[PDB]
Amino acid sequence: TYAFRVARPEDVEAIAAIDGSFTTGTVFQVAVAPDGFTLREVAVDPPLVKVFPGDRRTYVAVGAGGAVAGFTAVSYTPWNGRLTIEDIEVAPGHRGRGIGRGLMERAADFARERGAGHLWLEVTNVNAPAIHAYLRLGFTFCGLDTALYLGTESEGEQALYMSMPC
Amino acid sequence: TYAFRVARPEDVEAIAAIDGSFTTGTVFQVAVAPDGFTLREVAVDPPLVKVFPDGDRRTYVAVGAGGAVAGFTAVSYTPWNGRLTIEDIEVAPGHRGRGIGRGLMERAADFARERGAGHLWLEVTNVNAPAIHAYLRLGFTFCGLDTALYLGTESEGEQALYMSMPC
Ligand SMILES: CC(C)(COP(=O)(O)OP(=O)(O)OC[C@H]1O[C@@H](n2cnc3c(N)ncnc32)[C@H](O)[C@@H]1OP(=O)(O)O)[C@@H](O)C(=O)NCCC(=O)NCCS
Ligand SMILES: NCC(=O)N[C@@H]1[C@H](O)[C@@H](OC(N)=O)[C@@H](CO)O[C@H]1/N=C1\N[C@@H]2[C@H](O)CNC(=O)[C@H]2N1
Ligand SMILES: NCC(=O)N[C@@H]1[C@H](O)[C@@H](OC(N)=O)[C@@H](CO)O[C@H]1/N=C1\N[C@@H]2[C@H](O)CNC(=O)[C@H]2N1
């Protein structure tokens, strides 16, 4: 059984060690036309390995022994009532136990507390696993930026944008 | 007729007073599918009227023969992805269609090359067909959008379209 709280300074090491790295046999391929964009899930072989290089809050999911099993960092922009999920990670050995949903429910709580109109996140097109998890939690594609990762370690990837009403 | 320079503190009043408002007979309509987005230019009738609500930031001003600010562009460089963002570009009504827009974008391109940018990038509302057509002519293409960006704003019902070009 897992419990939730606001992250504390002593959690910083455990949070950094839940690093987000993953292997995927699928990516969301972006086809650019002059008049629009198509997202299509596509097989890759060999599997792709991805390693990552007041209105803010970080929540931590905690096991019975007090160990951080996941976290979410969120930020509110009053201008458009957007709660951004800046990061959400569940430790690999603690997946499929509802922690992801629980951290997103804490994000939804902060949203309602601030009077947000929608949840929003950025996810790289190669992160098919996270995209599938977000789809199941009720997020849909609201856009993308094919240029965001130009001149970065992630060049060749596209930033996909997902939202849901609060 | 028009010259360009870096904005000075005394220009702030003239820049704020420049009216970016426009009338359009067309909008770029955004169709959302589960698997993508289509942009299609479409007629609106009657015409839509739209009113708008440190070393790596710069504002340029276009100046008429009498020294009056006729247009401006605010730009910002992010070294992380080598992006020069055109944050704002506005030409005063009655100085439009005289090459000021191109001239301000050329100054943006100069700042890009000075900072070693890889691309120019801008946000434009889907209803701003005139600016979109001008950006297409200057060499920009659609690199994305955010259909949720204007939720809870005066612009709700519009979509943010994203355009880029290599430097
Ligand atoms: C982009 C903008 C600044 C251009 O203003 P401008 O000074 O009249 O533009 P220029 O005269 O430099 O023209 C630039 C190019 O775009 C073209 N262009 C401008 N409007 C066009 C239109 N509606 N259809 C087709 N081409 C168009 C020009 O003909 C020119 O191409 P050319 O060199 O082949 O002739 C325009 O958006 C504007 O009038 N500003 C109003 C404010 C605004 O739209 N704000 C931006 C949203 S934040
Ligand atoms: N859920 C967040 C997320 O996906 N993070 C990305 C993630 O860390 C890496 O992306 C891949 N593809 O690995 C990384 C590329 O090296 O880009 C991150 N995205 C960013 N960082 C930018 C700056 O904070 C400011 N301006 C932006 O617009 C932000 N966008
Ligand atoms: N060329 C710039 C531009 O298009 N400006 C828009 C413009 O001023 C209005 O939009 C329409 N459609 O009128 C306005 C809402 O009404 O939103 C602006 N866009 C923004 N402002 C946000 C903040 O700066 C911080 N974070 C963002 O992500 C920015 N996005």
Numbering used by the authors:
A (entry chain A): 8 to 60, 73 to 185
B (entry chain B): 8 to 60, 72 to 185
Lines quoted from the article behind this entry:
Here, we report a noncanonical FAD-dependent enzyme Orf1 that adds a glycine-derived N-formimidoyl group to glycinothricin to form the antibiotic BD-12. X-ray crystallography was used to investigate this complex enzymatic process, which showed Orf1 has two substrate-binding sites that sit 13.5 Å apart unlike canonical FAD-dependent oxidoreductases. One site could accommodate glycine and the other glycinothricin or glycylthricin. The resultant product is no longer sensitive to aminoglycoside-modifying enzymes, a strategy that antibiotic-producing species employ to counter drug resistance in competing species.
We then determined the structures of SttE in complex with ST-F or glycylthricin with CoA, of which crystals were packed in space group P1 and P212121 and determined at resolutions of 2.42 and 2.36 Å, respectively. The structure of SttE revealed a single core domain of a general control non-derepressible 5 (GCN5)-related N-acetyltransferase (GNAT) architecture, which is composed of seven extended β-strands and three α-helices. Both the extended strand β7 and β-hairpin between αA and β2 establish the substantial protein interface promoting protein dimerization, where D164 specifically interacts with R101 and W139 via electrostatic interactions. The AcCoA donor sits astride the fork with the acyl head facing the sidechain of the glycylthricin acceptor. The AcCoA binding site is composed of β4, αB, β5 and αC. Glycylthricin, on the other hand, is held by interacting residues (K75, F59, P60, D63, G54, W98, E105, D106, E141, T143, L167, Y168, S173 and E176), which as a whole define the ST binding site. In brief, residues D63, E141 interact with the guanidino group of streptolidine lactam by three H-bonds, while residues S176 and E176 associate the carbamoylated D-gulosamine with two H-bonds. D106 appears to be the base deprotonating the β-amine group for the acetylation modification to take place, while it is a bit far away from the terminal amine group of 4. Its nucleophilicity, nonetheless, may well be enhanced by two mainchain oxo groups (E105 and E141), thus accounting for the equivalent activity of SttE towards 4 and 7.
